[PDB]
Design a binder for these strands. Structure first.
Ligand SMILES: [Mg+2]
Ligand SMILES: [Mg+2]
Ligand SMILES: [Mg+2]
Ligand SMILES: [Mg+2]
Lengths: 197, 49, 31, 11, 38, 219, 134, 36, 120, 143, 62, 69, 100
RNA sequence: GGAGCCAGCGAGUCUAACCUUGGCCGAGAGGUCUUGGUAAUCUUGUGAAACUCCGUCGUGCUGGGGAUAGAGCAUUGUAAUUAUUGCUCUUCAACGAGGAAUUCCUAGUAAGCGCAAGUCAUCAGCUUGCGUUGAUUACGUCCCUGCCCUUUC
């Protein structure tokens, strides 16, 4: 394609198909756990996370929001970062690149796998304490929160930047290894619920 | 006066310290021109303003 | 009457003005 | 170096 | 030195006593000046 | 007699009120808004972050609201209270003195939110009657005869003392317990229009530099 | 039809500053090493050798964008926060930059005020844009 | 293990210029109440 | 005269005026090529209609966008919305209506904010 | 602590003041805490770096005791330290490198090790041999 | 192993504690078998939950 | 912590030998594993890139990512 | 030669590992900007650490800070009552008490 | 440290000296010579900030922190070596996320960021307005607490 205003080749390669940051495909990503299928949304591809959509209007409008945008929103936190979504999307871009580097698997699949794995399946409520089941929406929300907070606390006072620590945390959550903070908290919660079962 | 904002203004040489201002807040004052006013509040810095 | 008047449940310190104005009120009477 | 029953300094 | 504006009134115990005497005295005969449905 | 602006709906349509604050309110002002909501039975507190006066009034007028209450502060000390009546005013501004919040009381308890009885006293002048009419119509009409809650506005030298009391009818007397807050509100400006319209005609304003201001009465 | 506006800002500025430094005809004041460029700045430029050339390139490019620009507006544009209340930049540096640029003939004194991009400077900036584009 | 002595005051007080400033605040407040 | 259409896109205080005329696929924003938009990370947000609808429809037109007001993100949104609405208007005026319907279907399926303004 | 200056309340030194407070003065003896801290701190295991001391004040205040600390053995300067600790919330070393005594947020569990065995001293409970008990407990865990 | 159960009815007026909802779920493995469970998060019908235990019967949690 | 501030010969050899092995290469990785200063890591990463030992994936001023060639 | 982990300049110990500017800032009377100007006049590369310095560089910096004017350091760049007030306050307090 | 770089609400000089573009001088602050504007017209696109890109630094109470203090260069009066508001350098403290407890908060909302006016109440690094970036979670329940409504039972 030739235009009076020159356009890069990658732009027509994206014209062929929509890819996140023009580098990742949404075609092959699948949620393995059936229960989480209709709360982790990856079917609609997006070039960039930033959407400025309305998802707080209705109770379950959040489910339709793309998972990557939810992760970016959860990344920007703690006051000193509030209002800075551009940095959040930049850090997520770097994190996806790091994920692809460490493991050749598609990074979006890694994110989905980490979210699925770290979701708490059973928790406790006060009555003493008694064990109760968790709605999948709460599973997704708690998974995102735990992943993000673990990644943040890892690099709070360390040379590691947010991109590398977040990538490592997602990796370890995806593999299911206990190294990931979120997996530790999930296992602790399930154990506590089992005790009060 | 030395600093003026429409009705509001800052005055100097009435008082040597803000302590003197404190005793005279709400005091009725006027210009030679006859414009009336009030001592609103002592400025912390400088003393007397 | 007094018990159910926390402003004069009990009020937090420094909320009232009575002890100040009253004490000076006696002084103004003396002058 | 404090040792045994030696007490912390008194000023 | 002259004052320009009325001073802020102070809530002394006597003022509260007078006002509450008024409130009680009003409620004794049920003298309420309240809005009535048309 | 009821004012022309309120005469059409006087006693017909229950007032709808929105209580709000200035941009970036302090915690105390946010607290102070809360009891003002609790003060008026039909009030709703609205967070004003970045809202615009043309936008706020236009949205409120669309929703069918009756009155809008906005609060100003100075270092967490409530300072002013402005009441604007829709759809075309009037707008009354007040200054709050010696404000005493219920948060200042330990173990205070919860309020009762029945339609309260209203007490207006020492309002004699024509301007005073206007103030009564404006304040009178914030509340719901036809309070129950056994309604246990009474709100009093006492005019003392142009300073309207505001208190909130709950009573009980005993065999030999009635005993009232104030619930708070305590604050004195003085009218200092009144416009024939919404608070947004800065150009609305001023029905009345407080002259403070006139020589008789120190001894002058208005209400 | 290459123009300055067809090239990325950072690329054009860096390349054009390099071109000035190689050219060696740009007068640089003797105090460049001892100035902070602004009151808000805490310490002076790190790139002592070439920062003046880079500022010259930036000023030239803005003058290309905007037909007439003066010292005060350059001061505001190159100013930053020191509460912090957006202190303006140093006027002496901007004035010396303008004087040096009009010495080169890149810019020149504007009627109606300010400086206009000189036609010689016009073709020059288009040229450096051209080499950058490859 | 290392041993370090604790640092503390024999009598705890919760320089003179600050003490001067504190009195100014007290005197200012008292003067304010009298004037009103 | 040369066929041309004009559209206005808006978000917050940012307002973008887009002129779309017959041409040779020349797209410019604030007088600059679309490829130099900043911030770079949101550049693809500007590219959205271009890559969604395909560059072939653009090769026969020139597009000029002027943006004022608001912040960078709001300006980006104004640009993308103005581009989309200008293309729809041009295909309405000087092209058959089936193409207009397909364009509108594509844009609405992807993101409705491209066409309908979102006033907060 | 209570202002008279702030002084640690004592069973013998102060009797009228605690009566005004309405607290039973029998349970107003910080020397028992003093004596324990002395023996715990002076025990060889503390010198070996295998012991940390936690203090749950009757009011609910939880205090961190760094093993490196050296509390005074005189009861008066013992009290002078804790009035400083209770009000300042922490104590700094003479060399100013580490906070020996620090107040910490309740509950105790979050500060305790992930794998730990918990026991109390109970006169009514069965009598055991400490040496055998610790031996039969695992190694990675803590007591 | 964890079972999967789809919500078929969101029960109301259960006296359940705030933040917990008593629901009826049908096991995916056997549609006929139905069990009452208690959920901690926002829950709606046609949603699938993971049951760690398929034997316990839900009881009001005050 | 005492991070090496100067590139001495055995560290220079250590960088060249090991950095091909790491799948993921960045400033933090060099600091953590080789115990070298951050500034040297940035210089080394620019250095290693010129010989082609490491290939760039993305270049951002604050964060740089690299892989074995 | 061997990197100098520690150095003695102007009767002050400076760590080798720190940069020249931020190592010399430790010297009393020497700030970040003053050290930077001294380094520039000394023609010493700022990117170098303190230990990489040669002896001629060190003595050049020495003669720099001891002789700033001689090397064209800018002049603008280079470097009871309370008791009476207390007594007046006491007198005022006493008078106010006398009124009160 | 450089480079990129975008708002809105407003204010502004007659028998005066207000907003001030542009030119020159000054490291800066500021000075100086002119100029447009009684104002949708000139200051002003108020080229605001935060924010983005490229670089230095690098887990070290460190290039974080700027309290306290010293020395100078200027403005304002006024005639004192008096203060006043700015800039330059040096000095470089506590502070390593904060107990018991406690307050508020549901969408352009919490939160971050600056610009403007001090227009009879209040406000002077405080009030109000304006604009920029912009979230997590809930949006279900009377189980606990509290407040109501109905039984013209
Ligand atoms: Mg806020
Ligand atoms: Mg405010
Ligand atoms: Mg602010
Ligand atoms: Mg609700």
């Amino acid at each position: 394609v030739v235009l009076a205003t020159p356009i890069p080749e990658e732009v027509q390669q994206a014209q062929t198909e929509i890819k996140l940051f023009n580098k990742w495909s949404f075609e092959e990503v699948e949620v393995k756990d059936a229960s989480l299928v209709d709360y982790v949304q990856v079917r609609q591809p997006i070039f960039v996370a930033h959407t400025a959509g309305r998802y707080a209007n209705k109770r379950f409008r959040k489910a339709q929001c793309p998972i990557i945008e939810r992760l970016t929103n959860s990344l920007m936190m703690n006051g000193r970062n509030n209002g800075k979504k551009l940095k959040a999307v930049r850090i997520i871009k770097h994190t996806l690149d790091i994920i692809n580097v460490l493991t050749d698997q598609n990074p979006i699949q890694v994110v989905v796998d980490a979210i699925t794995n770290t979701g708490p399946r059973e928790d406790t409520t006060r009555v003493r304490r008694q064990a109760v089941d968790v709605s999948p929406l709460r599973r997704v929300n708690q998974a995102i929160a735990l992943l993000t907070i673990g990644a943040r606390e890892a690099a709070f006072r360390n040379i590691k930047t947010i991109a590398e620590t977040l990538a490592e945390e997602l990796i370890n959550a995806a593999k299911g290894s206990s190294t990931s903070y979120a997996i530790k908290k999930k296992d602790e919660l399930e154990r506590v619920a089992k005790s009060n079962r | 006066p030395y600093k003026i904002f429409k009705n509001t203004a800052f005055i100097k040489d009435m008082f040597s310290s803000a302590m003197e201002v404190a005793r005279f807040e709400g005091a009725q004052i006027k210009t030679v021109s006859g414009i009336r006013g009030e001592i609103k509040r002592a400025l912390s810095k400088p003393e007397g303003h | 009457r007094e018990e159910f008047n926390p402003f004069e449940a009990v009020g937090k310190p420094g909320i009232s003005k009575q002890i100040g104005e009253e004490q000076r009120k006696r002084a103004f009477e003396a002058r | 170096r404090f040792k045994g029953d030696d007490d912390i300094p008194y000023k | 030195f002259d004052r320009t504006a009325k001073p802020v009134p102070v809530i002394t115990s006597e003022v509260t006593e007078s006002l509450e005497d008024m409130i009680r005295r009003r409620i004794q005969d049920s003298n309420f000046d309240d809005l009535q449905r048309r | 007699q009821v004012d022309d602006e309120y005469a059409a709906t006087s006693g017909i349509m229950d007032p709808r009120i929105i209580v709000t604050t200035s941009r970036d309110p302090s915690t105390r002002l946010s607290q102070f808004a809360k009891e003002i909501k609790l003060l008026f039975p039909n009030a709703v507190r609205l967070n004003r972050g970045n809202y615009v006066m043309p936008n706020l009034v236009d949205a409120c007028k669309k929703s069918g609201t009756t009155d809008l209450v906005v609060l100003h502060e100075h270092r967490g000390v409530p300072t002013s209270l402005t009441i604007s009546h829709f759809p075309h005013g009037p707008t009354a501004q007040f200054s709050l003195h010696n404000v005493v919040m219920r948060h200042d009381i330990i173990n205070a308890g919860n309020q009762s939110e029945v339609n309260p009885h209203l007490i207006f006293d020492n309002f004699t002048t024509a301007l005073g009657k206007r103030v009564v009419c404006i304040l009178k119509h914030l509340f719901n009409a036809g309070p129950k005869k056994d309604s246990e809650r009474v709100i009093t506005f006492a005019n003392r030298g142009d300073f309207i003392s505001v208190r909130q009391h709950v009573y009980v009818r005993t065999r030999e007397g009635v005993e009232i317990a104030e619930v708070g807050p305590r604050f004195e509100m003085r009218l200092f400006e009144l416009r024939l229009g919404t608070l947004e319209n800065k150009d609305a005609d001023v029905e009345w304003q407080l002259r403070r530099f006139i020589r008789t201001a120190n001894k002058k009465d208005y209400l | 039809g290459v123009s300055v506006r067809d090239v990325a800002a950072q690329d054009f500025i860096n390349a054009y500053a390099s071109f000035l430094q190689r050219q060696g005809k740009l007068e640089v004041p003797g105090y460049v090493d001892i100035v902070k460029t602004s009151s808000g700045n805490e310490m002076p430029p790190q790139d002592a050798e070439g920062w003046f050339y880079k500022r010259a390139a930036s000023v030239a490019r803005h003058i290309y964008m905007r037909k007439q620009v003066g010292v005060g507006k350059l001061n505001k544009l190159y100013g930053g926060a020191k509460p912090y209340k957006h202190i303006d930049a140093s006027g002496s540096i901007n004035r010396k930059v303008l004087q040096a640029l009009e010495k080169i003939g890149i810019v020149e004194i504007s009627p109606k005020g300010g400086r206009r991009i000189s036609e010689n400077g016009q073709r020059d900036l288009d040229r450096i844009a051209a080499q950058t584009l490859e | 293990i290392p041993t370090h002595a604790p640092k503390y005051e024999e009598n705890f007080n919760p320089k003179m210029k600050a003490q001067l400033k504190k009195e100014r605040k007290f005197t200012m407040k008292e003067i304010r109440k009298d004037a009103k | 005269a040369v066929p041309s259409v004009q559209t206005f896109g808006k978000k917050k205080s940012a307002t973008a005026v887009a002129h779309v005329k017959a041409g040779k696929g020349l797209i410019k924003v604030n007088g600059s090529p679309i490829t130099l938009v900043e911030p770079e990370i949101l550049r693809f947000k500007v590219y959205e209609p271009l890559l969604l609808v395909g560059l072939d429809k653009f090769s026969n037109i020139d597009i000029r966008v002027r943006v004022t007001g608001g912040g960078h993100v709001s300006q980006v949104y104004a640009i993308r919305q103005a581009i989309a609405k200008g293309l729809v208007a041009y295909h309405q005026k000087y092209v058959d209506e089936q193409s207009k319907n397909e364009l509108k279907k594509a844009f609405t399926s992807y993101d409705r904010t491209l066409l309908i303004a979102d006033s907060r | 602590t209570h202002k008279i200056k702030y002084v640690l309340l004592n069973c013998d030194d102060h009797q009228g003041l605690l009566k005004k407070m309405g607290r039973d003065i029998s349970e107003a003896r910080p020397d028992i805490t003093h004596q324990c801290l002395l023996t715990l701190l002076d025990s060889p295991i503390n010198k070996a770096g295998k012991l940390q001391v936690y203090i749950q004040t009757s009011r609910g205040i939880l205090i961190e005791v760094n093993p490196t600390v050296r509390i005074p053995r005189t009861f008066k300067r013992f009290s002078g330290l804790m009035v400083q600790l209770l009000h300042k919330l922490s104590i700094r070393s003479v060399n100013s490198e580490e906070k020996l005594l620090k107040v910490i947020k309740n509950p105790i569990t979050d500060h305790l090790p992930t794998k730990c065995r918990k026991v109390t001293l109970s006169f009514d409970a069965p009598v055991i041999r400490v040496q055998d008990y610790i031996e039969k407990l695992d190694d990675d865990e803590s007591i | 192993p964890v079972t999967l159960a789809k919500v078929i009815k969101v029960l109301g007026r259960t006296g359940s504690r705030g933040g917990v909802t008593q629901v009826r779920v049908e096991f995916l493995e056997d549609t006929s078998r139905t069990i009452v469970r208690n959920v901690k998060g926002p829950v709606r019908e046609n949603d699938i939950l993971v049951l760690m235990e398929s034997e316990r019967e839900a009881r009001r949690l005050r | 912590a005492q991070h090496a501030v100067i590139l001495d010969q055995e560290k220079y050899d250590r960088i060249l030998k090991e950095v091909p092995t790491y799948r993921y290469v960045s400033v933090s990785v060099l600091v953590d594993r080789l115990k070298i200063g951050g500034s040297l890591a940035r210089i080394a990463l620019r250095h290693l890139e010129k010989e082609g030992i490491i290939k760039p994936i993305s270049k951002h001023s604050k964060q740089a990512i690299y892989t074995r060639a | 030669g061997s990197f100098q982990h520690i150095l003695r300049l102007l009767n002050t110990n400076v760590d080798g590992n720190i940069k020249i500017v931020y190592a010399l800032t430790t010297i009393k009377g020497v700030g970040r900007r003053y050290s930077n100007l001294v380094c520039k006049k000394a023609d010493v590369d700022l990117h170098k650490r303190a230990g990489e310095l040669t002896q001629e560089e060190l003595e050049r910096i020495v003669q720099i800070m001891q002789n700033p004017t001689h090397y064209k350091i800018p002049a603008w760049f280079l470097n009871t009552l309370a008791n009476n007030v207390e007594s007046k306050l006491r007198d005022d307090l006493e008078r106010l008490k006398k009124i009160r």
